[PDB]
Amino acid sequence: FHSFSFYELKNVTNNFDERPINKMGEGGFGVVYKGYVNNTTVAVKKLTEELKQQFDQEIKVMAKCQHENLVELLGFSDLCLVYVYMPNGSLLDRLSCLDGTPPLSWHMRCKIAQGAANGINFLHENHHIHRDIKSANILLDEAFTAKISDFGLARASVMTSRIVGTTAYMAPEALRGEITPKSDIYSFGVVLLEIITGLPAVDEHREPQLLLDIAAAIEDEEKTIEDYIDKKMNDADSTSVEAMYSVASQCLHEKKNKRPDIKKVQQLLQEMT
Numbered sequence: 718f719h720s721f722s723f724y725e726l727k728n729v730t731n732n733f734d735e736r737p738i739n740k741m742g743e744g745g746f747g748v749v750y751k752g753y754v755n756n757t758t759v760a761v762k763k764l765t766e767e768l769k770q771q772f773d774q775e776i777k778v779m780a781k782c783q784h785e786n787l788v789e790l791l792g793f794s795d796l797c798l799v800y801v802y803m804p805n806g807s808l809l810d811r812l813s814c815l816d817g818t819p820p821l822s823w824h825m826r827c828k829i830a831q832g833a834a835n836g837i838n839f840l841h842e843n844h845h846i847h848r849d850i851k852s853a854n855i856l857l858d859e860a861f862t863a864k865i866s867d868f869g870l871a872r873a874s875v876m877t878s879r880i881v882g883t884t885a886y887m888a889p890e891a892l893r894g895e896i897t898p899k900s901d902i903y904s905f906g907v908v909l910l911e912i913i914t915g916l917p918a919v920d921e922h923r924e925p926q927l928l929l930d931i932a933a934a935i936e937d938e939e940k941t942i943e944d945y946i947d948k949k950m951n952d953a954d955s956t957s958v959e960a961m962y963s964v965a966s967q968c969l970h971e972k973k974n975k976r977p978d979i980k981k982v983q984q985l986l987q988e989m990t
């Protein structure tokens with residue numbers, strides 16, 4: 718950790734230039750900018766007291782959660798969080814091949830899914846619920862090691878009146894204010910479908926619009942997973958694919974109690990390879 722000056726961060730972000738190439742992404746909770754400090758390329762997240770909680774929620778969890786499959790926080794400071802730069806961005810942007818990056822091989826996809834499961838496993842073992850598991854919050858380092866980000870809106874492992882998260886990924890019970898680690902499982906389910914299909918979780922111009930409903934159609938023998946396997950790879954085999962799809966289907970059980978725990982997800986993803 719460390720305590721950066723707002724002016725230093727401002728200086729290394731070209732006055733937080735809200736224009737891409739120093740900007741690199743934007744959630745609901747803030748904007749992310751590229752920076753250089755201590756000869757280290759960094760990410761700078763600039764973030765009513767709700768927002769100030771998400772800052773300390775990020776610090777509190779990042780103060781007591783270091784794992785190979787979680788992003789690393791370097792410091793803080795207009796509230797600003799500083800992270801180690803993830804040169805290969807988000808799983809979402811790499812699945813979509815944004816900026817012309819090569820399609821991820823099935824081999825790398827299988828590694829990213831296990832990494833992502835291990836990061837969720839560490840969170841759940843340390844009595845944290847992420848509450849916003851999605852391809853955009855799985856980041857990729859210099860070796861394409863999966864790194865879970867955005868532990869804002871996380872909570873100790875109940876109902877809330879402020880339903881938060883990303884609709885296209887959220888469990889039914891989470892959409893009704895419930896807060897259970899089994900919500901993280903369902904959302905990871907949607908991530909596994911993104912990995913298999915290369916399709917976004919919501920596409921306004923697509924029928925169906927939600928990848929969730931594609932999942933349901935396949936369970937009702939009206940679609941097939943083979944017909945949805947991402948065509949932008951040459952190293953997929955049916956066995957590993959339909960084994961990963963099996964994990965996603967178990968993850969996407971509408972009834973929370975019938976979904977596996979993150980430990981069983983990890984095991985099933987290992988058995989796959």
Ligand SMILES: O=C([N]C1=[C]C2=[C]N([C]C(=O)N3[C][C]N(C(=O)C4=[C][C]=[C][C]=[C]4)[C][C]3)N=C2[C]=[C]1)C1=[C]C([N+2](=O)=O)=[C][C]=[C]1
Pocket residue numbers: 741742749759760762788789800801802803804805806807816817818819856866867
């Ligand atoms: O670094 C954090 N995030 C982020 C990091 C990010 C890197 N990029 C750029 C990116 O992936 N690029 C990929 C390669 N590119 C090319 O053009 C290319 C290269 C080879 C062949 C063809 C094309 C362009 C650059 N985009 C990013 C967004 C977000 C981060 C964020 C947080 N966070 O709390 O938001 C925490 C920890 C780390």
